[PDB]
């Protein structure tokens, strides 16, 4: 008769449109709560440093748990231990970069590699513009550039990661599923640093660029990005 | 049908309205405004009645045929682009025409026409430059203006008026419009001293004269 078939398929199309609209309201209010959480995270450290200073004492802040690691030296002539740790840190090409959470195994892996990388503690703006500008996803071991929220939600929905700013929240506030979210991210392919490098072959302490510059990596992501 | 309003969001920057979705719910007042729920002609022929089919089938089919393009969005045709001047060009500005056969000549600018082009006369008594169109990009705009706001440019001259037809002979209404706008511009620029000699003279570069160093 088809007077029933067309109204049933219209009800199904309207139902999935309403489902998609409720998902977009979910993503909106989640991004709002994340903004509030980042306000509170930023003001909490300032408020506690102030109360320690007016009590006279000091306040050693939370030792940072998230690094961004960039491979600065090329393929040629690398010791094999350093080779294996670099290819577990997923820094294969030169001027790649991955997020890495910090603990005792990871810091020592990083200082085996230390002449070959520049790694630091990224800001929220650095995590933002790395996910938005160079952030692609390892979907079905293909490098699909993250253009919708469905590319992130179909792979990371079971970790309650359903949009890109939720992925950003996971990476910055290193959560339970940091391994899964970071391993979803393909290794970032940054350009050569605009303005240049002071010296590739020496540590940041020694007037160079290798090693652990701590939050001066947020000077350098901005010009490699 | 009702009479249409205009956009209740004032445009803050491009793409962002100044009022959020709940404020615009309130201002539109949707809270009290809710709702619920060819091809044949038959002609007489002297016979019977003949059902003529308009939109007939085609007579011919080419042996190989191209497919349809993909649909993209922002690629408007030229006649509905947005039109810009520079900041240095206001009506009354003297301009230095740089590309035509009227190159180097100083010229009073009149108005911004509908297809982006400028309207132009450095008056024909002075430097033999008629009511002409000129392209904005191809023109140096000096900082020398006249108090032109009290003139009446004719409304019947646009791009369809200056666009070429196909020996070129000057028509009569060209002379009439030329005279009717020059009689309003030329006494307004004889009021500024030494300006008519400026508009008769031509711009040129001599030795030791560099356009980046020189202010105009």
């Amino acid at each position: 008769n088809f007077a029933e078939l067309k109204i049933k398929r219209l009800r199904k199309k309207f139902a999935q449109k309403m489902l998609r609209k409720a998902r977009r309201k979910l993503i909106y209010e989640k991004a709002k709560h994340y903004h509030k959480e980042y306000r509170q995270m930023y003001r909490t450290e300032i408020r506690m440093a102030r109360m320690a200073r007016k009590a006279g004492n000091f306040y050693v802040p939370a030792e940072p748990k998230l690094a961004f690691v960039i491979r600065i030296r090329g393929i040629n002539g690398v010791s094999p231990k350093v080779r294996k740790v670099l290819q577990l840190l997923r820094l294969r090409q030169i001027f790649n970069g991955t997020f890495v959470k910090l603990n005792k195994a990871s810091i020592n892996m990083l200082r085996i590699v230390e002449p070959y990388i520049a790694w630091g503690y990224p800001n929220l703006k650095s995590v933002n513009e790395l996910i938005y500008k160079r952030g692609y996803g390892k979907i079905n071991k293909k490098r699909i550039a993250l253009t919708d929220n469905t590319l992130i939600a179909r792979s990371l929905g079971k970790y309650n990661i359903i949009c890109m700013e939720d992925l950003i929240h996971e990476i910055y506030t290193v959560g339970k599923h940091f391994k899964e979210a970071n391993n979803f991210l393909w290794p970032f392919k940054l350009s050569s640093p605009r303005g240049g490098m002071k010296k590739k072959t020496t540590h940041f302490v020694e007037g160079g660029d290798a090693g652990n510059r701590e939050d001066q990596i947020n000077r350098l992501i901005r010009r490699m990005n | 049908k009702g009479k249409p309003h205009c956009s209740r969001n004032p445009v803050l920057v491009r793409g962002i309205g100044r009022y959020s979705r709940s404020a615009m719910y309130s201002r539109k007042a949707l809270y009290k405004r809710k709702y619920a729920a060819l091809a044949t002609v038959t002609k007489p022929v002297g016979g019977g009645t003949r059902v003529v089919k308009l939109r007939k089938m085609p007579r011919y089919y080419p042996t190989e045929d191209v497919p349809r393009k993909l649909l993209s969005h922002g690629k408007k045709p030229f006649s509905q682009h947005v039109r810009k001047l520079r900041a240095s060009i206001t009506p009354g500005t003297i301009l230095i025409i740089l590309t035509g056969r009227h190159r180097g000549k100083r010229v009073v600018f009149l108005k911004q026409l509908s297809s982006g082009l400028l309207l132009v006369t450095g008056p024909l008594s002075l430097n033999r430059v008629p009511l002409r169109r000129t392209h904005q990009k191809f023109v140096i705009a000096t900082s020398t203006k006249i108090d032109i706001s009290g003139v009446k440019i004719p409304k019947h001259l646009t791009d369809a008026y200056f666009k070429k037809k196909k020996k070129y002979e000057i028509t009569e209404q060209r002379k009439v419009d030329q005279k009717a706008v020059d009689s309003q511009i030329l006494p307004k620029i004889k009021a500024v001293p030494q300006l008519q000699g400026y508009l008769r003279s031509v711009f040129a570069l001599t030795n030791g004269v560099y356009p980046h160093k020189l202010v105009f």
Partner: peptide, 19 residues
Amino acid sequence: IAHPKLGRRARARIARGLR
């Protein structure tokens, strides 16, 4: 509300209330 099976009656109730 926004996940499909358990929020089905909820999204239906919102869709009815939009009239």
